[PDB]
Design a protein around this ligand. Structure first.
Ligand SMILES: [Co+2]
Ligand SMILES: [Co+2]
Lengths: 262, 259
């Protein structure tokens, strides 16, 4: 690794970072950006691999970076707010390697809760669910099919750091169904048609996978057939008009209700 | 003539619609924008005053609009995109009168829950909370102190139309405390110091007001002190998004009344 200074937007290295706004670029580098000195520090203690740092504590992190084998760019106020796209930005920004837990290395144990999200499309929702799942003590997030990107700048930010702290797995629909069948789990799916009251469900017998549907479409029948129980949250009309993050939060706090205490 | 065609983005009438991005014009006209044919329809059925309709059922809405006093504007898809500021926008847009309920006219009763937000600042939080309180059967939202505007475009959007369905009141801290003290309510405030587990509080004896602190400062002493109970949500290792936390509160306060 090495240190190097930059003040030009046209600089080769800066073009590469800004290109992480785009999904296709991030996928090819398997990389992503996270803003915040503190967050950068916490990420390192949790075993995240850092590729580039950008900006007194500042100086020992720069040290740790070069030591494991990656770059360090000192920069002007105009560059940092270009790459992070904020008029008034943070002084520090790390570029890390993405990580996904492979689905077949997940073996749910007693007391555990996972949240599986079928074709989640809103980065706000995805990031808020990740944070909430971490607050609630879930052991993992499983992204099923084509979802919005958990490592995009907008999702990461809405995690407030929880992206570093709870594992995330991705799978197509077939592999997910196979994994769930063989995992010995109670799959609780929110799905209006065929439902029981979320509060009457057995969350204690087996590890729980909470299966949530896509914001607009909801779960398809093939996922919904895979469920041990179909959940609804009773509302003041016969409508289900809950934001996906909110419903997901409600479900996490009920499923772990018997496990969370003051 | 109440129906009228416009081409030019320069056309005065289109500049005034775009002025509803500024808070000051919104406040002095008392008006605001809501996008979507189904939303405009539901607003008209819920009895909101439409000032302006911009664009089959469209024909039906257009006639409710002339019959209730409003103006109709037929326009190019360029025009519609420029007032919104959204790629691929809805094809119908309504401009409505703002409606606040005065606080003094709310007399809470047994089985009712209200949400009070202390200087909420994020438009997406405010909007999802309005929508969630609507879904849970809450009877009112109470904006306490300086808050983000519930009738901004960003808040209205995040409500999914719920801005039309649940009353909104606004009050300075002092009128809230005055109201609350005379209203016969159990105020349950999310606040860490002095708090109990949200699940052990008494949500049955009195109509409940859930009081949710500002996202970073939390509740000022004046409000926390008045609360009948201080609540908290047990977490693994205190940092829920305001709106998630409010949803969880609402669905516990109303746990005994929803089935
Ligand atoms: Co590339
Ligand atoms: Co004006």
């Amino acid at each position: 690794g090495q240190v190097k200074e930059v003040t030009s937007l046209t600089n080769p290295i800066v073009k590469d970072i800004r290109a992480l706004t785009q999904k296709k670029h991030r996928d090819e580098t398997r990389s992503f950006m996270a803003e915040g000195l503190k967050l950068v520090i916490d990420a390192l203690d949790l075993g995240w691999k850092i590729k580039t740092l950008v900006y007194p504590q500042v100086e020992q992190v720069a040290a740790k970076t070069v030591a494991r084998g990656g770059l360090v760019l000192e920069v002007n106020e105009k560059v940092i707010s270009t790459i992070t796209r904020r008029d008034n930005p943070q002084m520090v920004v790390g570029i890390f390697e993405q990580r996904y837990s492979p689905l077949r290395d997940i073996h749910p144990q007693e007391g555990e809760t996972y949240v599986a999200l079928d074709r989640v499309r809103d980065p706000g929702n995805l990031g808020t669910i990740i944070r909430t799942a971490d607050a609630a003590g879930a052991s993992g997030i499983i992204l099923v099919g084509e979802t919005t990107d958990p490592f995009s700048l907008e999702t990461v930010r809405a995690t407030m750091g929880s992206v570093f702290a709870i594992p995330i797995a991705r799978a197509n629909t077939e592999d997910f169904i196979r994994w769930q069948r063989a995992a010995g789990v109670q799959v609780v799916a929110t799905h209006l048609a065929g439902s029981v009251d979320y509060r009457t469900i057995d969350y204690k017998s087996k590890p729980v996978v909470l299966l949530m549907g896509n914001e607009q479409a909801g779960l398809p029948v093939e996922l919904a057939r895979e469920a041990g129980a179909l959940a609804r949250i009773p509302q003041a009309g016969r409508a289900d008009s809950l934001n996906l993050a909110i419903a997901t939060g409600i479900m996490l706090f009920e499923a772990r209700r018997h496990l969370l205490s003051l």
